[PDB]
Design a protein around this ligand. Structure first.
Ligand SMILES: O=C(O)[C@H]1O[C@H](OP(=O)(O)OP(=O)(O)OC[C@H]2O[C@@H](n3ccc(=O)[nH]c3=O)[C@H](O)[C@@H]2O)[C@H](O)[C@@H](O)[C@@H]1O
Ligand SMILES: O=C(O)[C@H]1O[C@H](OP(=O)(O)OP(=O)(O)OC[C@H]2O[C@@H](n3ccc(=O)[nH]c3=O)[C@H](O)[C@@H]2O)[C@H](O)[C@@H](O)[C@@H]1O
Ligand SMILES: Nc1ncnc2c1ncn2[C@@H]1O[C@H](COP(=O)(O)OP(=O)(O)OP(=O)(O)O)[C@@H](O)[C@H]1O
Ligand SMILES: Nc1ncnc2c1ncn2[C@@H]1O[C@H](COP(=O)(O)OP(=O)(O)OP(=O)(O)O)[C@@H](O)[C@H]1O
Lengths: 639, 216, 101, 110
């Protein structure tokens, strides 16, 4: 027949050879960079390729060109998927290193040793949507000797594979094969083993541990343990039924080096201290300082602009946990004064453009930096473009740099406005394009400024190892989102501005009809996601960009206005304020001035949030409206 | 838009994970800051946007050896050293090439600022008439190269070859499929109109650079 | 190429800016008025040497995988064509005893 | 030294340092004035106090040998440059300086 092969390493070469000797015509071989499969291909004059992703359209197209009868996969590492698999009429078979459906995961050669199996084998099965599930075409058992180790079993398997293919390959070339399906309710699966999986826990049986050192013996990384601060590797083991009232982990003797295990003792025949050379156990004992004796503060968060909407709520959240120490600076302090007595809260009244000694010293001293100082009220973008630019961009770029200088983690606050007038139904952190208007539409100076910062942080991450996480809030709201006073100058976000209207008895204006919509997120939901990011469990947030909003709370500004009004009319304090002056459509220019342009819709993709944080918004919009309204109404002095 | 308009077109770049736009975004922020200074502090300015201007001295064959040069000058290096001309992602994407002579004339007019008609103005400068795909640029260049007096000094053509952008620009590259300028503002403020045709620019450029190569 | 064949680093050359390594060679007393360094053919990949030609049986462009010469020829962009200011010294205190001399 | 000086009554002790676990027991002492700082950052405080006090004891340093070979430049910058700055504040404001030299200055003296 005519085929396209996906091979690598040893199995790859014997596979390509078996295939050749069986009379197949190999149109092309796909392998990887680093017996070399490439060299072989080269030596045989078979076009060989090593793209990172053969699943790419070009390749699929090219592989289709070759028009192969059947496809073979001999230890190819990247994953070949359906799209291309079905281009071979005769099908696509893979050679797995285990007696399927058992050990259908990966690293079977090691796993079988770990669990001390008495036998294993090679299986040539058909490739289906499910990994290593396809119908079995041929299999072959192998006995695992008690003194076998990864490498010796590897050859055992290679030899087996050479034999299995030798005879079942000619069979496929014609049509004599039986797709004996797999007993799904017997399949076992295992995943990638990391070098940390070869750690020795002396409480287990000497048998168990002994299989560990065998499972990963040289050339593999090997089983390791610790002598105090020192890490050493066991290359040669030896189980001793020879009991020992000694507690597990303790050294029974130094010649031979016999460690007491949960059941029996393990003799370390050979190993190496650290990256040292390998030596006999007795010597390893000395170079580790052994004799008969047993073997094996809170996070400082810096918040700039801590008194802000995000700031004060984040502070409250962090102060709840005990493993956090919060350091903060800000021009104001009314929102965080309630925390001034907290032992783990260190506040200081300052200005990011003046108090350098403090700011630099603390970036240098803390563990994570959250630069929340900014101006994020739209009216200011057109009204004071330069103040916005200087504060939002220049002042922060300085902090970003303190962070790279002192190699600190920075959780920078991006914005949903960075997407601009993106057209996607869902603004995606990793795929959506960013759209803003002409330079004569200054409202975008903020959007573009925040975007350039995101890019610089990204370059610092890529080119200088800066550890970061960018988060983009989607119209978060709740108590303290600005204040009625700033709203008197238009310097506040929608919700808080409309409350001022109801409070003062002026009409609620709907800029350009108010038909544009947004996804409102409750501040409680937002802070929870942010908290997760600070926690950075499993470092799943490094280099990540994460939107944080509730796609479920989509509403037009007009609807926001109605929902607010409804609550307001039912509020106990209602009688204190004037009668509703009604809703009124207004040209954006008469509120934001010339050069304003807006976003007709904004909904976030919250996949990343789900993936990195296992987070999901919960609070519904109406509840946020109530919270917010209540807070601000009780802010009004009535007398 | 079919025509990138200085006063009406929206600006579109890709995700932050596509760092090729760092340049675009940086230049935009500067345009906005200059604009603010103009509006809020009386700065007298004029922003001009060149559209793929080319001709003699557009980079140099040497910088091209490191990919640090624009397309035309890079392809010339290919013909010169005898390496193939690679068409990033098929080379079907197009651009509007403008002769440096046309560009400098427009710019000159802007400096002249007759009647102060350029104050606070944003002006594109390009020849919407010279739209061509990179593939077509490569062919026109090749055609001229084959007829050139110095041709026999350089190796035989290694041919055109489609290449993944990543293998030339690295990860994080993304491009512009088409780029044509609106030259209304230029006409209105400068009474300017591009004149030189692309083929002539190709010839001028090629000649200059071939005579840059030391042959001995 | 034999002296440093795999597992050793291997013999290398350049195609313009590109560096490639010759793993398998093969001398051809088969003349070629072609000047040394120029490509005689791309299948087999035959390079004209000062005396006779050398056939590149297998090699790799850059850090890519090894492949037969004909393929190496393509991945390098080969066809029948040839393969392969002053120093600024800043002196501060130049007028001094060491400097002027 | 702080413990010692704080015993006498004719002394007023002003001190700055990155850490404070060893001197926290004195924070309540009326004659002890401590402030958490970095000699390479907090200039206002340092200069103002060299100017205000009577004797200056620049004890900031790295004196653990492994660091000499492991981080020679960090040692040079902290032990030498940072201190040369304090020495100069002293001559500027004509203050007495009790500088801590080292037995290591003798090297392999015979
Ligand atoms: O938290 C968010 O995600 C974003 O909120 C704001 O931007 P935006 O939502 O556009 O503006 P708001 O002031 O919150 O109001 C939303 C829209 O309501 C409308 N509006 C506002 C106020 C008003 O009185 N009437 C009215 O109709 C306007 O069209 C306005 O653009 C900030 O400018 C962004 O930086 C931030 O990322
Ligand atoms: O003068 C212009 O208007 C713009 O020219 C360049 O950007 P661009 O035209 O995108 O890129 P070039 O390097 O000039 O080449 C154009 C396209 O040709 C293609 N190309 C280039 C080089 C090559 O060897 N092969 C190839 O196919 C690439 O896709 C490339 O983006 C500059 O980056 C812009 O700042 C400038 O405004
Ligand atoms: N020069 C400055 N120095 C210090 N703090 C400043 C300075 N300028 C502004 N701030 C502070 O930044 C804080 C955070 O801003 P603010 O609460 O208005 O918005 P935010 O919480 O970032 O909103 P969003 O999450 O919607 O972007 C403000 O409380 C203010 O005290
Ligand atoms: N502040 C300064 N700026 C520039 N040049 C200076 C300065 N101070 C001294 N020099 C120069 O440095 C030059 C070199 O010094 P000089 O010739 O005295 O000794 P030398 O050649 O280094 O001697 P040796 O080789 O014996 O050490 C002098 O000619 C003088 O002009």
């Amino acid at each position: 027949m005519k085929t396209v092969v996906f091979a690598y390493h040893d199995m790859g070469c014997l596979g390509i050879e078996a295939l050749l000797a069986a009379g197949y015509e190999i149109s092309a071989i796909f392998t990887h960079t680093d017996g070399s499969v490439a060299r072989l291909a080269a030596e045989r004059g078979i076009p060989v390729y090593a793209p990172d992703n053969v699943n790419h359209p070009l390749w699929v197209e090219r592989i289709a060109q070759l028009s192969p009868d059947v496809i073979f996969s001999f230890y190819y590492r990247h994953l070949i998927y359906d799209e291309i698999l079905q281009l071979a009429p005769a099908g696509a078979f893979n050679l797995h290193g285990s007696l399927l459906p058992k050990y259908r995961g990966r690293a079977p050669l090691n796993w079988v040793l770990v669990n001390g199996e008495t036998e294993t084998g090679v299986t040539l099965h058909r490739m289906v949507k499910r990994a290593d599930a396809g119908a079995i075409v041929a299999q072959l058992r192998i006995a695992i000797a008690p003194d076998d180790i990864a490498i010796t079993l590897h050859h055992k398997l290679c030899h087996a594979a050479r034999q299995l293919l030798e005879q079942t390959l000619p069979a496929i070339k014609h049509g004599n094969i039986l797709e004996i399906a797999q007993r799904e309710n017997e399949a076992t699966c295992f995943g990638r083993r990391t070098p940390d999986d070869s750690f020795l826990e002396w409480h287990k049986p000497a048998s168990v541990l002994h299989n560990m050192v065998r499972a990963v013996a040289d050339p593999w990384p090997g089983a390791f343990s610790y002598v105090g601060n020192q890490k050493f590797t066991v290359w040669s083991s030896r189980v001793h039924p020879h009991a020992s009232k000694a507690q597990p982990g303790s050294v029974i003797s130094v010649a031979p080096l016999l460690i007491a295990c949960g059941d029996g003792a393990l003799e370390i025949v050979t190993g190496q201290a650290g990256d040292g050379i390998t030596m006999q156990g007795s010597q390893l004992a000395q170079t580790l300082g052994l004799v008969q004796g047993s073997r094996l503060r809170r996070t400082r968060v810096l918040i700039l602009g801590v008194n802000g909407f995000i700031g004060n709520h984040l502070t409250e959240r962090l102060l709840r946990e005990d493993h956090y120490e919060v350091y903060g600076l800000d021009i104001g302090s009314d929102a965080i004064s309630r925390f001034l007595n907290h032992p783990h809260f260190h506040f200081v009244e300052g200005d990011i453009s003046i108090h350098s000694e403090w700011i630099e010293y603390h970036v240098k001293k803390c563990d994570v930096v959250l630069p929340l100082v900014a101006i994020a009220t739209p009216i200011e973008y057109t009204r004071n473009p330069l103040r916005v630019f200087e504060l939002d961009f220049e002042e922060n770029l300085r902090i970003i740099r303190y962070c790279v200088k002192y190699r600190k983690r920075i959780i920078f606050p991006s914005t949903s406005e960075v997407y601009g007038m993106c057209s996607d139904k869902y603004f995606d952190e990793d795929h959506s394009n960013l759209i803003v208007g002409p330079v004569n539409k200054p409202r975008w100076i903020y959007s573009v400024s925040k975007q350039l910062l995101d890019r610089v942080i990204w370059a610092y991450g890529e080119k200088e190892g800066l550890q970061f996480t960018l988060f983009r809030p989607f119209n978060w709201m709740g108590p303290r989102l600005d204040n009625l006073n700033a709203a008197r100058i238009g310097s506040s976000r929608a919700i808080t501005q409309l409350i001022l209207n109801l409070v003062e008895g002026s009409p609620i204006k709907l800029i350009d009809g108010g038909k544009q919509k947004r996804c409102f997120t409750d501040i409680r939901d937002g802070i929870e996601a942010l908290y997760r990011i600070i926690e950075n469990a499993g470092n799943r947030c490094d280099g990540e960009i994460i939107n944080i909003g509730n796609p479920e709370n989509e509403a037009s500004i007009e609807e926001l206005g109605e929902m607010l009004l409804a609550s307001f009319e039912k509020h106990p304090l209602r009688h204190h304020f004037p009668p509703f002056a009604g809703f009124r459509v207004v040209e954006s220019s008469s509120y934001y001035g010339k050069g304003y342009q807006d976003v007709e819709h904004r909904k976030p993709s919250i996949r990343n949030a789900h993936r990195c944080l296992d987070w999901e918004p919960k609070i519904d919009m109406q509840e946020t409206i109530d919270e917010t309204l209540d807070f601000f109404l009780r802010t009004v002095d009535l007398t």
